[PDB]
Amino acid sequence: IKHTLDIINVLTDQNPIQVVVDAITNTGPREDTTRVGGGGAARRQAVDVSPLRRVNQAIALLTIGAREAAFRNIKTIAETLAEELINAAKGSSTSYAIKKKDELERVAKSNR
Amino acid sequence: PPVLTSKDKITKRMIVVLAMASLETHKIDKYVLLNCDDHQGLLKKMGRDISEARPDITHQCLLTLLDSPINKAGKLQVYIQTSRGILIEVNPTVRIPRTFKRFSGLMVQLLHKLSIRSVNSEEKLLKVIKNPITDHLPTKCRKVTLSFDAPVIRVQDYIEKLDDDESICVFVGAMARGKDNFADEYVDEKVGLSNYPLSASVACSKFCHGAEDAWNIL
Amino acid sequence: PPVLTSKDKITKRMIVVLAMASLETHKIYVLLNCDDHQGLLDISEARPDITHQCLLTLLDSPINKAGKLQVYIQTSRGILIEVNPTVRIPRTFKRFSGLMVQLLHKLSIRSVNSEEKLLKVIKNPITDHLPTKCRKVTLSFDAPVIRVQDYIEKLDDDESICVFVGAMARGKDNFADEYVDEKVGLSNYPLSASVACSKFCHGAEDAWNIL
Amino acid sequence: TPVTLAKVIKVLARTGSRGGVTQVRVEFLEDTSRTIVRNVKGPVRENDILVLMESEREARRL
RNA sequence: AAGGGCACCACCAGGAGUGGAGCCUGCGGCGCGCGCUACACUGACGGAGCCAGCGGAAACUCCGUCGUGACGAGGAAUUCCUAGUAAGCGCAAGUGCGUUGAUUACGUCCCUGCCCUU
- What does the DSSP assignment read for D4-54? EEEEEEEE-SS----TT-EEEEEE-SSSSS-EEEEEE-S---SS--EEESS
Tell me the residue type at C137: V
CA–CA gap between residue C162 and residue C68 (Å, rounded): 12
Contact B196 C62 (CB under 8 A): yes
Q: How far is the CA of A79 from the C1' of E40 (A)?
A: 19
Q: How far is the CA of D19 from the C1' of E112 (A)?
A: 14
Kindly report the bases of strand E lying within 7 A of a protein C-beta atom: 4, 10-13, 20, 41-42, 68, 71-72, 74-77, 103-111
CA–CA gap between residue B2 and residue B93 (Å, rounded): 10
Which neighbouring-strand residues pair with C19? C74, C166
C-beta separation of D7 from D29 below 8 A: yes
What's the DSSP call for residue C126? G
C-beta separation of A36 from A66 below 8 A: no
C-beta separation of B103 from B63 below 8 A: no
Which neighbouring-strand residues pair with C166? C19
Phi-psi region of B105 (alpha: psi -120 to 50; beta: other; left: phi over 0): alpha
C-beta separation of A43 from A34 below 8 A: no
C-beta separation of C22 from C48 below 8 A: yes
Q: What element of type H or E holds C181?
A: none
Resolution (A): 5.1
Q: How far is B132 from chain C (nearest CA, A)?
A: 31
CA-wise closest residue to B171 among B179, B182, B185, B162: B182
Q: Which nucleotide is nearest to A68 (CA to C1')?
A: E42
- Phi, psi dihedral angles at B129 (to 5 degrees): -135, 175
For B32, half-sphere exposure in the C-beta direction (CA atoms, 13 angstrom radius) is: 13
Which chain D residues have a beta carbon less than 8 Å from that of A51? 42, 48-49
CA separation (Å) from C110 to C3, C83, C103, C119? 16, 12, 9, 7
Q: How far is the CA of A63 from the C1' of E92 (A)?
A: 39
- Sort C22 into a burial class: Cβ within 10 Å, 0-12 / 13-18 / 19+: buried
C-beta separation of A58 from A21 below 8 A: no
CA–CA gap between residue C67 and residue C125 (Å, rounded): 24
C-beta separation of B80 from B71 below 8 A: no
Q: What element of type H or E holds C27?
A: none
CA-wise closest residue to C144 among C193, C93, C186: C186
Helices (H), chain C: 34-37, 48-59, 62-65, 93-106, 148-153, 193-207
Is the torsion defined by CA of D11, D16, D20, D25 positive or negative? negative
C-beta separation of C20 from C166 below 8 A: yes
- Phi, psi dihedral angles at C72 (to 5 degrees): -125, 150
- Phi, psi dihedral angles at A94 (to 5 degrees): -145, 35
Q: Say which of D41, D49, D51 has its CB closest to residue A47.
A: D41
Q: Which chains touch C (3 or more CB pairs under 8 A)?
A: B
Q: Are strands C160-166 and C117-122 parallel, antiparallel or unpaired?
A: unpaired
CA-wise closest residue to C99 among C165, C44, C55, C36: C55
CA–CA gap between residue C130 and residue B182 (Å, rounded): 44
The three-state secondary structure class of A64 is: helix
CA–CA gap between residue B60 and residue B174 (Å, rounded): 9
Does B181 contact chain A (CB < 8 Å)? yes
C-beta separation of C165 from C18 below 8 A: yes
CA–CA gap between residue C19 and residue B25 (Å, rounded): 37
Full DSSP string of A18-61: HHHHHHHHTTS-SB--B---TTSS---B--B--HHHHHHHHHHH
CA separation (Å) from D55 to C175, D2, D38? 70, 9, 10
C-beta separation of A46 from A104 below 8 A: no
Full DSSP string of C37-85: HTTT--GGG--HHHHHHHHHHHHTSHHHHTT-EEEEEEETT--EEEEPT
CA–CA gap between residue B121 and residue B127 (Å, rounded): 14
Name the experimental technique: cryo-EM
Q: How many CB atoms lie within 10 A of CB C185?
A: 19
- Phi, psi dihedral angles at B166 (to 5 degrees): -120, 125
C-beta separation of B61 from B79 below 8 A: no
CA–CA gap between residue B135 and residue A107 (Å, rounded): 15
Q: What element of type H or E holds C174?
A: none
C-beta separation of B210 from B16 below 8 A: no
CA–CA gap between residue A112 and residue A45 (Å, rounded): 7
Reduce the secondary structure of chain B to three states and give it as a string.
Answer: CCCCCCCCCCCCCEEEEEEEECCCEECCCCCEECCHHHHHHHHHHHCCCCCCCCHHHHHHHHHHHHCCHHHHCCCEEEEEEECCCCEEEECCCCCCCCCHHHHHHHHHHHHHHCEEECCCCCCEEEEEECCCHHHHCCCCEEEEEECCCCCECCHHHHHHCCCCCCEEEEEEECCCCCCCCCCCCCCCEEEECCCCCCCHHHHHHHHHHHHHHHCCCC
Is the torsion defined by CA of A72, A74, A76, A80 positive or negative? negative
Cα C110 versus chain centre, distance: 20
Query: How many residues are listed for chain A in this entry?
Result: 112
Helices (H), C72-191: 93-106, 148-153
Q: How many CB atoms lie within 10 A of CB C17?
A: 27
| Span between the terminal Cα atoms of chain C, in Å | 14
Q: Angle, nearest 10°, between helix axes B55-66 and C48-59?
A: 90
Q: How many CB atoms lie within 10 A of CB D1?
A: 6
The three-state secondary structure class of C20 is: strand
CA–CA gap between residue B35 and residue B25 (Å, rounded): 9
